[PDB]
């Protein structure tokens, strides 16, 4: 049939841009988010979503933009956990319930961020989330093989989107994190 | 004029061995854990605990031992989150509320684990927790300067033995005594990371 | 005008595959190696080459592939230094003398390899070289901005039983195809927001 | 009966400080370098040196590099720095290993620049990256001989020395790189 893509968080930002570049006559591109009635942080909602989608080829997760900023000593832990619930656990749930529907040659592309490795004050929540995502990405790449699992690590929306396509298209890549940060890590 | 230590999870395992070694004519060593009525995953408890301790010199967190093993697709997420609450958020809470009482020249030493970097099937909860601790360790180190913050990353082999508690404890003592070290992660894994 | 590519080591292997994919009617693809009279380990030979080419857009270095296998205690140091001279110092010489000729929006893409981080007995020369390449990539990326500098880090790429032995252990289930690796170069070349990065394409070998 | 230490680069700086801390009634501490006539970048010279030492327990290598942009630095100078620090370490490990007693170790020196990206420092960065990668292969090949690296920043010499001592004393540590950079890696 057609190659089916699922872009969670793909209603806006990078997600939307990627969805646009994926739209063709030979593909089906599902996008979902809080806007479309998917709470990626809620397991039953995530399970529901993938039940309505069925078998597809490539899963992309970009959801999770908010996080409380400030020093560890100041930042409210409840807000921090709420940040974790969406960007980290959201990805975990997505992989957990999406995986069984991936067709042969399928892939999962998660999203971390440079803050996983660039040490910046005020950003422990984002750094912790991203570091966890990158560790989980590699365990998944191992457990789910031959299903490929990679992460894009952002620092133009089209240049970021290009990295996802590359993850989706390269059949020899798995368990890797691709930095697209315009040299912020330097 | 004694140097004061707090070891969270210092009632057993690495913490207990480290607490013994820290005991001396010039030190006071407070140990706390579930056994002593401290729930490190609860902010109220942790906030109150440090209230009773007052100003001290070195904080060491070794607590949070359990995590549900298994594939990502199999592991119950609530259990995963619960493990996160204790080891990771426990360390965050300890640092968040412990930092205020640290005397000048003091330090915080956290515990991660080799699984943060050694990719092993069925260990995504520990891998994620440890990776998170190490990233947070470095942020803390930057924000708390001149207070030093480091992490010890224990392993279970090239060395031909399994790690003794005193070998791990030695790493903590090194972090505590070396005042030119902050924001580092000290591996003591018997070479397991070499795979 | 036409976009100009220089692929050092592009007369065979990964480089040859990449040169074929870059080949088109609106591009100019220069390939060179020992076969074409370029000794990338010899500074005056590298200087000569870029004088003949002049201004161009993208430099890709895949040159140098041999290194003595074995333990540190056994490997003849003189052979190690020779391998270093080609793959590492060759890349340094290519960037040093090629840089001034890169047009606006140009880039440099070097080649390391998984052995920079996958710890494998008997491979210290390759590991050392690749670790050196990747550290140098990032310093370059910083000194040459806005010229972009990145590095591709391939795993095993396509006796028959050795391939079967590998495939079985690789998460992807197959051994690298030359074009799988070349795709990564094309991505580094086309992505104007990527610099200072190392791109792993190793079929999951780094996972252990 | 005593424990024997060899510190290449031990006549000054970190090496000298470490040698001071290792000296005691129950140890023997050999120090060597250019100052004592040892040329660590010369294979024959390193080989012969260990002949004079014989069996021992712990080798420590703490043994300049041209600063400048990659486009500016003279490559023969860059190669000369590599000869002394990287290949010097390789030669020390290569010819000193067979002499190491049971429970012995090798501790090399890299530096934060292997991982802190700084303009004008490509030679040091490349050297320290090479060291840290070679360190881990060695730790794997030489097991159960332990092999670690100390990575200093641009600090107090005794604090750096403490890191070496820690590497030497911990029997459960091999293939690791210990940062004692005073927070410089944090940026």
XYZ file of C-alpha atoms in Angstrom:
776
model
C 0.000 0.000 0.000
C 1.241 3.485 0.906
C 4.033 4.191 3.383
C 2.408 5.376 6.599
C 3.984 7.932 8.917
C 2.944 8.960 12.427
C 4.237 12.303 13.685
C 3.333 12.926 17.326
C 3.688 16.623 18.043
C 3.385 17.106 14.297
C 0.635 19.731 14.343
C 3.108 22.590 14.777
C 6.805 23.463 14.913
C 9.291 20.949 13.536
C 6.585 18.297 13.540
C 4.372 20.217 11.130
C 7.282 21.080 8.837
C 8.303 17.417 8.706
C 4.720 16.359 7.998
C 4.602 18.706 5.011
C 7.811 17.312 3.509
C 6.418 13.798 4.005
C 3.098 14.417 2.250
C 3.070 12.800 -1.191
C 0.761 10.750 -3.405
C 2.504 7.574 -2.215
C 2.351 8.257 1.528
C -0.068 8.760 4.408
C 0.988 11.136 7.174
C -0.877 11.164 10.483
C -0.216 14.057 12.851
C -1.431 14.252 16.433
C -1.062 16.370 19.559
C -3.018 18.007 22.382
C -4.736 19.943 19.604
C -6.114 16.749 18.039
C -7.133 15.021 21.268
C -3.977 13.036 21.999
C -2.420 13.439 25.432
C 0.936 11.762 24.835
C 1.563 11.737 28.593
C -1.576 9.665 29.224
C -1.076 5.954 28.529
C -4.714 5.104 27.761
C -4.905 7.989 25.293
C -1.694 6.832 23.610
C -2.957 3.255 23.406
C -6.239 4.516 21.965
C -4.491 6.550 19.265
C -2.403 3.682 17.879
C -5.467 1.430 17.931
C -7.131 3.880 15.538
C -4.060 4.010 13.283
C -3.128 0.346 12.946
C -0.093 -0.858 10.999
C 2.308 1.865 9.851
C 5.962 2.263 8.868
C 7.668 5.166 10.650
C 7.030 6.765 14.047
C 8.313 10.261 14.841
C 7.988 11.911 18.256
C 8.577 15.663 18.549
C 6.060 16.547 21.274
C 7.166 18.221 24.504
C 8.304 21.844 24.358
C 7.711 23.181 27.886
C 9.830 22.829 31.015
C 10.314 24.996 34.117
C 13.577 26.949 33.980
C 15.875 27.914 36.842
C 18.367 26.349 39.245
C 17.750 22.931 40.781
C 17.475 24.588 44.196
C 14.732 26.943 42.978
C 12.697 25.033 40.379
C 9.422 23.473 41.545
C 9.670 19.674 41.357
C 5.982 19.258 40.475
C 6.427 21.322 37.314
C 9.638 19.443 36.531
C 7.849 16.100 36.804
C 5.058 17.456 34.596
C 7.727 18.312 32.039
C 9.103 14.778 32.314
C 5.609 13.327 31.947
C 5.192 14.821 28.475
C 8.579 14.750 26.740
C 10.224 11.682 28.307
C 7.398 9.378 29.373
C 5.436 10.504 26.329
C 8.183 9.088 24.123
C 8.372 5.913 26.224
C 4.618 5.358 25.962
C 4.667 6.102 22.229
C 7.393 3.516 21.655
C 5.760 1.050 24.049
C 2.394 0.983 22.284
C 3.390 2.043 18.769
C 6.138 -0.532 18.289
C 3.931 -3.587 17.704
C 2.353 -1.843 14.699
C 5.549 -1.010 12.808
C 5.830 -2.850 9.491
C 9.024 -4.527 8.293
C 11.686 -1.926 7.528
C 10.035 0.432 10.004
C 11.658 2.948 12.341
C 11.216 5.157 15.396
C 12.758 8.624 15.524
C 12.677 10.339 18.906
C 13.683 13.884 19.815
C 16.166 14.932 22.492
C 18.236 18.121 22.348
C 21.718 19.594 22.669
C 21.096 20.360 26.349
C 21.671 16.669 27.017
C 25.383 17.413 26.615
C 25.778 21.205 26.580
C 25.882 22.247 30.227
C 23.790 25.393 30.675
C 22.632 26.782 34.019
C 18.844 26.842 34.554
C 18.247 23.873 32.248
C 18.575 20.741 34.408
C 15.047 19.543 33.576
C 15.540 19.731 29.807
C 19.044 18.288 30.122
C 17.841 15.408 32.294
C 14.924 14.671 29.965
C 17.120 14.713 26.857
C 19.843 12.565 28.426
C 17.209 10.020 29.444
C 15.693 10.029 25.948
C 19.088 9.345 24.364
C 19.826 6.450 26.723
C 16.362 4.994 26.140
C 16.752 5.428 22.385
C 19.794 3.144 22.364
C 18.215 0.484 24.586
C 15.191 0.519 22.270
C 17.390 0.247 19.179
C 18.780 -2.913 20.759
C 15.559 -4.456 22.069
C 13.461 -3.682 18.988
C 15.983 -4.629 16.286
C 15.654 -4.940 13.337
C 13.288 -1.999 13.860
C 15.577 1.029 13.763
C 15.503 3.586 16.565
C 17.293 6.933 16.471
C 17.099 10.387 18.025
C 17.385 13.856 16.532
C 19.070 16.433 18.769
C 18.213 20.050 17.793
C 20.128 23.122 18.972
C 15.512 26.724 10.207
C 12.780 24.123 10.697
C 13.557 22.594 7.295
C 17.146 21.802 8.276
C 15.914 19.989 11.377
C 13.272 18.146 9.368
C 15.998 17.033 6.962
C 17.625 15.105 9.814
C 14.439 13.138 10.517
C 14.109 12.184 6.849
C 17.715 10.992 6.957
C 16.959 8.877 10.026
C 13.902 7.492 8.241
C 15.747 6.805 4.978
C 19.076 5.326 6.129
C 18.582 1.587 6.628
C 22.053 1.194 8.154
C 21.507 3.620 11.034
C 20.211 2.635 14.471
C 20.907 3.573 18.081
C 22.452 6.876 17.017
C 21.808 10.484 18.007
C 22.024 13.063 15.215
C 23.025 16.579 16.236
C 21.582 19.473 14.252
C 22.475 22.457 16.422
C 24.271 24.896 14.127
C 27.374 24.379 16.252
C 25.944 25.195 19.672
C 27.787 22.249 21.226
C 31.109 23.830 20.246
C 34.946 22.264 64.835
C 34.006 18.922 63.283
C 33.337 18.166 59.620
C 29.752 16.986 59.192
C 28.563 14.413 56.655
C 25.113 13.305 55.535
C 24.747 9.964 53.776
C 21.308 9.253 52.331
C 20.949 5.503 51.990
C 23.834 5.179 54.426
C 22.100 2.486 56.462
C 23.244 -0.306 54.134
C 25.379 -1.252 51.136
C 27.794 1.310 49.732
C 26.424 4.038 51.989
C 26.992 2.067 55.180
C 30.546 1.165 54.170
C 31.247 4.806 53.313
C 29.687 5.969 56.583
C 31.954 3.644 58.556
C 35.044 4.894 56.728
C 34.041 8.533 57.299
C 33.784 8.033 61.065
C 36.705 9.702 62.829
C 37.728 11.882 65.775
C 37.102 14.980 63.647
C 33.842 14.077 61.898
C 30.131 13.628 62.520
C 28.302 11.288 60.158
C 24.520 11.336 59.823
C 22.913 8.430 57.991
C 19.299 8.258 56.882
C 17.017 6.158 54.708
C 13.600 4.503 54.798
C 14.872 2.510 57.772
C 15.407 5.726 59.739
C 12.070 7.148 58.608
C 13.307 9.266 55.706
C 11.436 8.927 52.421
C 13.773 10.622 49.945
C 11.099 10.628 47.226
C 8.857 12.879 49.343
C 9.685 16.593 49.391
C 8.096 17.320 52.784
C 10.103 14.549 54.423
C 13.368 15.637 52.795
C 12.745 19.301 53.621
C 12.074 18.458 57.269
C 15.037 16.088 57.565
C 17.584 18.739 56.604
C 15.881 21.178 58.966
C 16.869 18.945 61.879
C 20.445 18.475 60.648
C 21.333 22.125 60.117
C 24.545 23.348 58.506
C 26.868 20.572 57.333
C 29.783 20.023 54.949
C 29.273 17.096 52.563
C 26.124 15.515 51.132
C 26.244 12.010 49.657
C 23.274 10.263 48.043
C 23.477 6.512 47.399
C 19.785 5.717 47.886
C 17.278 4.246 45.428
C 18.283 0.682 44.610
C 15.275 -0.915 42.885
C 13.995 -0.539 39.325
C 11.723 -2.854 37.298
C 13.789 -4.850 34.791
C 12.389 -5.700 31.355
C 11.720 -4.538 27.795
C 10.253 -1.069 27.229
C 7.164 -2.678 25.688
C 6.707 -4.914 28.737
C 7.650 -2.794 31.760
C 4.730 -1.228 33.623
C 5.236 2.534 33.349
C 3.888 3.292 36.835
C 6.637 1.084 38.261
C 9.195 2.828 36.060
C 7.961 6.218 37.251
C 8.074 5.015 40.860
C 11.712 3.980 40.468
C 12.379 7.406 38.968
C 10.710 9.065 41.958
C 13.156 7.467 44.397
C 16.580 7.421 42.749
C 16.408 10.423 40.402
C 13.894 12.829 41.931
C 15.215 11.674 45.292
C 18.659 12.982 44.367
C 17.125 16.155 42.930
C 15.173 16.719 46.142
C 18.229 15.990 48.294
C 20.291 18.499 46.314
C 17.459 21.043 46.167
C 16.978 21.108 49.939
C 20.447 20.017 51.052
C 22.315 22.753 49.187
C 21.027 25.483 51.509
C 22.785 23.934 54.515
C 26.176 23.251 52.899
C 29.038 25.145 54.531
C 31.619 26.874 52.355
C 34.048 24.341 50.890
C 31.481 21.550 50.911
C 30.279 19.185 48.196
C 27.464 16.988 46.893
C 28.190 13.500 45.574
C 25.478 11.612 43.720
C 25.200 8.047 42.473
C 24.553 7.019 38.882
C 25.705 3.714 37.396
C 27.454 2.233 34.378
C 24.113 1.451 32.728
C 23.883 5.143 31.846
C 26.398 4.378 29.096
C 26.511 0.579 28.802
C 23.631 -0.384 26.520
C 21.961 -3.495 27.937
C 18.578 -4.938 26.978
C 15.944 -4.865 29.742
C 17.580 -1.971 31.634
C 15.980 1.161 30.155
C 14.697 2.379 33.539
C 18.150 2.280 35.139
C 19.862 3.555 31.989
C 17.487 6.518 31.839
C 17.724 7.265 35.564
C 21.521 7.191 35.579
C 21.844 9.248 32.395
C 19.534 11.792 34.009
C 21.566 11.887 37.232
C 24.835 12.479 35.383
C 23.386 15.308 33.293
C 21.893 16.889 36.412
C 25.175 16.456 38.278
C 26.939 18.710 35.778
C 24.203 21.353 35.780
C 24.303 21.371 39.592
C 28.089 21.688 39.521
C 27.784 24.775 37.333
C 24.985 26.387 39.341
C 26.373 25.652 42.813
C 30.018 26.651 42.291
C 32.070 26.967 44.409
C 30.139 24.101 46.026
C 31.443 21.032 44.207
C 29.138 18.406 42.729
C 30.185 15.005 41.414
C 28.711 11.576 40.697
C 30.036 8.077 41.322
C 29.152 5.510 38.667
C 29.460 1.993 40.139
C 29.371 -1.205 38.100
C 28.157 -4.682 39.038
C 35.253 -8.480 33.868
C 38.722 -7.207 32.855
C 39.770 -6.793 36.516
C 38.871 -10.403 37.318
C 36.650 -9.642 40.306
C 33.301 -8.195 41.335
C 33.381 -4.841 43.102
C 33.811 -4.732 46.867
C 31.815 -2.080 48.725
C 35.044 -0.505 49.979
C 36.319 -0.069 46.421
C 33.212 1.959 45.590
C 33.393 3.873 48.865
C 36.951 4.908 48.000
C 35.585 6.740 44.961
C 33.249 8.809 47.138
C 36.117 9.694 49.478
C 38.120 10.864 46.461
C 35.285 13.093 45.274
C 34.952 14.478 48.795
C 38.670 15.173 49.307
C 39.716 16.488 45.881
C 38.799 20.184 45.847
C 39.767 20.558 42.185
C 37.036 18.178 41.035
C 33.502 19.279 40.182
C 31.035 18.234 37.504
C 32.757 14.903 36.882
C 31.465 11.330 36.757
C 33.846 8.789 38.298
C 33.580 5.273 36.894
C 34.359 2.337 39.155
C 32.973 -0.555 37.137
C 35.764 -3.134 36.989
C 36.057 -2.454 33.271
C 32.483 -3.399 32.384
C 32.145 -0.300 30.194
C 34.823 -1.720 27.893
C 32.235 -4.337 26.964
C 27.333 28.223 -11.691
C 28.087 24.550 -11.062
C 28.616 23.180 -7.561
C 32.117 21.733 -7.235
C 33.029 18.678 -5.155
C 36.457 17.341 -4.187
C 36.482 13.749 -2.937
C 39.885 12.633 -1.670
C 39.976 8.844 -1.766
C 37.088 9.000 -4.211
C 38.581 6.588 -6.747
C 37.285 3.583 -4.793
C 35.210 2.315 -1.871
C 32.908 4.736 -0.081
C 34.399 7.716 -1.901
C 33.823 6.205 -5.337
C 30.224 5.398 -4.443
C 29.709 8.979 -3.241
C 31.327 10.504 -6.330
C 28.920 8.510 -8.486
C 25.928 9.890 -6.585
C 27.264 13.448 -6.748
C 27.859 13.025 -10.472
C 25.360 15.027 -12.515
C 25.208 17.665 -15.256
C 25.152 20.644 -12.864
C 27.948 19.435 -10.603
C 31.702 19.025 -10.935
C 33.162 16.075 -9.052
C 36.931 15.865 -8.661
C 38.226 12.581 -7.266
C 41.856 11.953 -6.373
C 44.059 9.419 -4.614
C 47.403 7.648 -4.966
C 46.092 6.239 -8.247
C 45.619 9.747 -9.655
C 48.937 10.985 -8.279
C 47.852 12.477 -4.961
C 49.733 11.400 -1.853
C 47.472 12.954 0.779
C 50.115 12.311 3.446
C 52.606 14.553 1.631
C 52.041 18.274 2.214
C 53.537 19.567 -1.045
C 51.414 17.044 -2.943
C 48.258 18.268 -1.220
C 49.169 21.900 -1.855
C 49.780 21.034 -5.503
C 46.395 19.368 -5.897
C 44.301 22.269 -4.610
C 46.249 24.739 -6.753
C 45.110 22.796 -9.818
C 41.483 22.731 -8.651
C 41.052 26.294 -7.417
C 37.797 27.496 -5.864
C 35.259 24.784 -5.021
C 32.299 24.118 -2.727
C 32.638 20.877 -0.758
C 35.619 18.842 0.439
C 35.097 15.198 1.378
C 37.984 13.162 2.784
C 37.627 9.381 2.875
C 41.294 8.687 2.158
C 43.430 6.344 4.253
C 42.051 2.913 5.104
C 44.984 0.719 6.159
C 46.380 0.416 9.672
C 48.395 -2.369 11.321
C 46.124 -4.620 13.390
C 47.279 -5.988 16.738
C 48.005 -5.290 20.396
C 49.900 -2.188 21.512
C 52.728 -4.409 22.771
C 53.137 -6.130 19.391
C 52.405 -3.485 16.750
C 55.446 -1.965 15.042
C 55.267 1.712 16.002
C 56.771 2.800 12.673
C 53.860 1.165 10.850
C 51.421 2.869 13.219
C 52.903 6.288 12.474
C 52.621 5.612 8.744
C 48.913 4.849 9.090
C 48.519 8.036 11.118
C 50.346 9.995 8.415
C 47.698 9.083 5.834
C 44.300 9.003 7.541
C 44.749 11.604 10.300
C 47.509 13.938 9.116
C 46.215 13.539 5.572
C 42.878 14.976 6.669
C 44.641 17.784 8.520
C 46.655 18.626 5.409
C 43.534 18.508 3.233
C 41.707 20.957 5.497
C 44.735 23.194 6.025
C 45.312 23.791 2.316
C 41.814 23.196 0.948
C 40.055 25.628 3.276
C 41.082 28.875 1.572
C 39.487 27.649 -1.673
C 36.031 26.836 -0.266
C 33.307 29.126 -1.621
C 30.662 30.723 0.585
C 28.307 28.103 1.990
C 30.978 25.452 1.505
C 31.806 22.578 3.842
C 34.317 19.913 4.844
C 33.347 16.328 5.642
C 35.931 13.990 7.149
C 35.841 10.275 7.912
C 36.514 8.626 11.262
C 34.859 5.347 12.244
C 33.061 3.534 15.050
C 36.363 2.290 16.498
C 36.809 5.772 17.950
C 34.306 4.726 20.624
C 33.759 0.973 20.218
C 36.542 -0.515 22.311
C 37.920 -3.511 20.422
C 41.144 -5.360 21.218
C 43.857 -5.121 18.540
C 42.529 -1.843 17.102
C 44.309 0.947 18.992
C 45.812 2.575 15.878
C 42.409 2.864 14.196
C 40.745 3.946 17.441
C 43.425 6.560 18.093
C 43.199 7.932 14.548
C 39.395 8.116 14.605
C 39.326 9.741 18.050
C 41.840 12.278 16.733
C 39.789 12.944 13.595
C 36.629 13.635 15.592
C 38.283 15.998 18.073
C 39.921 17.816 15.159
C 36.626 17.979 13.261
C 35.084 20.019 16.062
C 38.011 22.406 16.518
C 37.972 22.924 12.742
C 34.212 23.496 12.757
C 34.837 26.245 15.293
C 37.837 27.884 13.614
C 36.413 27.782 10.083
C 32.864 29.032 10.686
C 30.833 29.821 8.728
C 32.470 27.018 6.725
C 30.831 23.860 8.063
C 32.900 20.901 9.241
C 31.521 17.471 10.118
C 32.652 13.849 10.163
C 31.005 10.609 9.093
C 31.738 7.600 11.291
C 31.064 4.361 9.373
C 30.858 0.853 10.758
C 31.691 -2.248 8.730
C 30.759 -1.739 5.074
C 30.652 -4.112 2.102
C 35.080 -13.586 3.521
C 31.378 -14.240 2.909
C 31.291 -16.022 6.268
C 32.844 -12.984 7.950
C 29.929 -10.918 6.656
C 27.463 -13.502 7.958
C 29.246 -13.479 11.320
C 28.838 -9.703 11.535
C 25.289 -9.349 10.189
C 24.160 -11.776 12.885
C 25.498 -9.500 15.628
C 24.351 -6.184 14.125
C 20.884 -4.951 15.220
C 20.013 -3.991 11.620
C 20.700 -7.562 10.506
C 22.819 -6.586 7.503
C 26.300 -5.273 6.724
C 26.805 -1.733 5.473
C 26.212 -0.953 1.820
C 28.544 1.661 0.343
C 25.563 3.834 -0.579
C 24.190 3.693 2.966
C 27.399 5.414 4.069
C 27.478 7.850 1.149
C 23.960 8.984 2.039
C 25.380 10.347 5.292
C 27.915 12.464 3.414
C 25.169 13.873 1.193
C 23.272 14.793 4.356
C 26.234 16.617 5.899
C 26.781 18.441 2.606
C 23.155 19.519 2.162
C 22.365 20.453 5.774
C 23.376 24.088 6.264
C 22.510 23.929 9.971
C 24.939 21.126 10.799
C 28.541 21.753 11.855
C 30.858 20.239 14.449
C 28.910 16.971 14.385
C 29.929 13.328 13.998
C 27.410 11.142 12.163
C 27.291 7.465 13.125
C 26.207 4.967 10.492
C 27.244 1.605 11.908
C 24.177 -0.637 11.847
C 24.079 -0.445 15.638
C 27.556 -1.845 16.283
C 28.160 0.820 18.943
C 25.349 -0.737 20.988
C 27.573 -3.743 21.661
C 59.091 -6.562 49.142
C 58.566 -2.854 48.452
C 56.214 -1.412 45.840
C 58.006 0.043 42.820
C 56.812 3.070 40.842
C 58.036 4.549 37.564
C 57.062 8.130 36.765
C 58.013 9.207 33.259
C 58.023 12.990 33.339
C 58.627 12.818 37.070
C 61.343 15.463 37.476
C 58.964 18.440 37.402
C 55.343 19.579 37.463
C 52.707 16.956 38.212
C 55.217 14.121 37.945
C 57.550 15.615 40.533
C 54.648 16.322 42.888
C 53.365 12.758 42.541
C 56.837 11.300 43.074
C 57.042 13.292 46.299
C 53.744 11.854 47.545
C 54.691 8.293 46.567
C 58.038 8.341 48.387
C 58.065 6.380 51.645
C 59.855 3.644 53.585
C 57.883 0.911 51.811
C 58.152 2.201 48.236
C 60.741 2.774 45.530
C 60.144 5.635 43.105
C 62.021 5.964 39.823
C 61.632 9.237 37.938
C 62.812 9.842 34.382
C 62.558 12.386 31.578
C 64.648 14.525 29.236
C 66.344 16.064 32.269
C 67.657 12.626 33.260
C 68.511 11.699 29.676
C 65.414 9.671 28.824
C 63.877 10.536 25.456
C 60.381 9.070 25.704
C 59.737 9.667 21.987
C 62.665 7.404 21.060
C 61.871 3.682 21.109
C 65.397 2.360 21.704
C 65.793 4.815 24.567
C 62.540 3.764 26.240
C 63.247 0.059 25.747
C 66.693 0.325 27.333
C 65.317 2.412 30.206
C 62.936 -0.316 31.371
C 65.799 -2.798 31.126
C 67.556 -0.767 33.819
C 64.408 -0.684 35.958
C 63.325 -4.320 35.811
C 60.068 -5.587 37.300
C 57.796 -3.005 38.928
C 54.204 -2.339 39.989
C 52.929 0.997 38.657
C 53.851 3.007 35.569
C 52.731 6.634 35.384
C 53.232 8.787 32.296
C 52.878 12.550 32.720
C 55.336 13.548 29.994
C 54.513 21.043 24.678
C 52.431 21.484 21.527
C 52.271 24.278 18.930
C 49.205 26.463 19.467
C 47.381 28.014 16.521
C 44.646 27.420 13.959
C 44.763 24.257 11.854
C 45.434 26.391 8.773
C 48.357 28.197 10.437
C 50.179 25.587 12.532
C 53.221 23.932 10.954
C 52.446 20.225 10.585
C 55.992 19.012 11.305
C 55.721 20.823 14.638
C 52.354 19.165 15.235
C 53.928 15.800 14.459
C 56.759 16.516 16.908
C 54.311 17.166 19.744
C 52.542 13.922 18.844
C 55.868 12.085 18.954
C 56.506 13.091 22.565
C 53.107 12.917 24.276
C 51.025 10.372 22.334
C 53.626 8.020 20.865
C 55.715 8.531 23.994
C 52.872 7.032 25.999
C 52.400 4.231 23.475
C 56.100 3.368 23.685
C 56.018 3.424 27.490
C 53.035 1.081 27.618
C 54.462 -1.079 24.829
C 57.834 -1.703 26.488
C 56.881 -1.385 30.155
C 53.944 -3.795 30.245
C 55.907 -7.054 30.447
C 57.676 -5.734 33.564
C 54.492 -5.040 35.553
C 53.842 -7.250 38.583
C 50.462 -8.760 39.450
C 47.987 -6.113 40.589
C 49.990 -3.422 38.817
C 48.647 -0.590 36.675
C 49.386 1.990 33.991
C 48.147 5.563 34.338
C 48.419 7.932 31.389
C 47.756 11.653 31.050
C 45.362 13.278 28.590
C 43.674 16.611 29.300
C 40.309 18.352 29.196
C 40.989 19.610 25.665
C 40.155 16.163 24.311
C 36.532 17.109 25.013
C 36.435 20.883 25.519
C 36.376 22.390 22.037
C 38.703 25.393 21.963
C 40.025 27.361 18.997
C 43.784 27.183 18.402
C 44.138 23.875 20.278
C 43.667 21.160 17.634
C 47.055 19.531 18.311
C 46.490 19.110 22.057
C 42.866 18.107 21.492
C 43.813 15.436 18.958
C 46.571 14.111 21.222
C 44.384 13.836 24.319
C 41.570 12.231 22.339
C 44.068 9.704 20.993
C 45.368 9.006 24.501
C 41.918 8.451 26.006
C 40.954 6.049 23.211
C 44.269 4.194 23.403
C 43.891 4.031 27.180
C 40.667 2.035 26.897
C 42.002 -0.434 24.322
C 45.048 -0.992 26.538
C 42.875 -1.604 29.604
C 41.123 -4.316 27.592
C 44.237 -5.910 26.084
C 46.291 -5.842 29.282
C 43.673 -7.013 31.787
C 44.069 -7.725 34.605
C 46.684 -4.953 34.450
C 44.594 -1.843 35.046
C 44.928 1.116 32.693
C 43.451 4.559 33.312
C 44.034 8.168 32.303
C 44.076 11.381 34.323
C 42.673 14.414 32.499
C 43.802 17.711 34.092
C 42.552 21.181 33.203
C 44.681 24.260 32.526
C 45.241 24.077 39.331
C 47.025 22.714 42.395
C 49.587 20.048 41.502
C 48.887 17.937 44.591
C 45.200 17.696 43.661
C 46.144 16.341 40.246
C 48.589 13.979 41.934
C 45.775 12.788 44.188
C 43.946 11.598 41.073
C 46.888 9.436 40.022
C 47.093 7.960 43.524
C 43.376 7.161 43.321
C 43.871 5.401 39.988
C 46.808 3.474 41.444
C 44.980 2.424 44.616
C 41.543 1.421 43.281
C 41.642 -2.217 42.154
C 38.175 -1.983 40.598
C 39.033 0.848 38.203
C 40.299 0.219 34.667
C 39.655 1.865 31.306
C 38.387 5.090 32.868
C 39.359 8.730 32.354
C 39.377 10.841 35.523
C 38.632 14.540 35.165
C 40.344 16.903 37.576
C 39.791 20.130 35.672
C 38.281 22.380 38.336
C 35.034 22.637 36.389
C 36.515 23.924 33.132
C 34.675 21.264 31.107
C 31.369 22.702 32.332
C 32.156 25.829 30.324
